[PDB]
């Protein structure tokens, strides 16, 4: 029977609601990956700096520490694969599938990360 469905559909219908990438000013001078421009990235895209570091760690087996603006990360990583990583980060962590909102916040939800959006309150995969 396709008659009580129609009403439901109608109800559903009734109740309904990129240049942002910054230039990475970094020398590929390696052995230890140094990102001095990362503060600007954090600022422009509206994000805490630590989350990006965490993402990087998740991507590739690295070990380092946070310093005030500048990063000391172990590894010789280039100005194109890091760039690719950045591009990915900007493609999925900034973007929310249901509604593209600005306000996104960090949450440690158990070992794998899952962030929350301040506008609606939805759990997004913070790994893929």
């Amino acid at each position: 029977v396709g008659l009580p469905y129609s009403e439901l559909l109608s109800r559903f219908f009734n109740i309904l609601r990129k240049f942002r990438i910054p230039p990475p000013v970094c020398l590929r001078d390696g052995k230890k990956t140094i990102f001095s421009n990362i503060q600007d990235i954090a600022e422009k895209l509206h994000r805490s700096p630590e989350h990006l570091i965490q993402y990087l760690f998740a991507e590739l087996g690295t070990s380092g520490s946070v310093d005030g603006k500048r990063l000391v990360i172990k590894g010789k990583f280039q100005s194109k694969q890091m760039e690719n990583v950045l591009r990915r980060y900007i493609l999925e962590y900034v973007t929310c599938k249901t509604c593209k909102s600005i306000n996104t916040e960090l949450k440690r939800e158990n070992r794998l990360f899952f962030m929350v959006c301040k506008s609606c309150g939805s759990t997004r995969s913070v790994s893929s």
Partner: peptide
């Protein structure tokens, strides 16, 4: 039975 639903908006679950 046929139901229309949205997982992300959180509606029509009651039905």
């Amino acid at each position: 039975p046929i139901v229309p639903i949205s997982a992300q908006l959180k509606y029509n679950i009651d039905a």
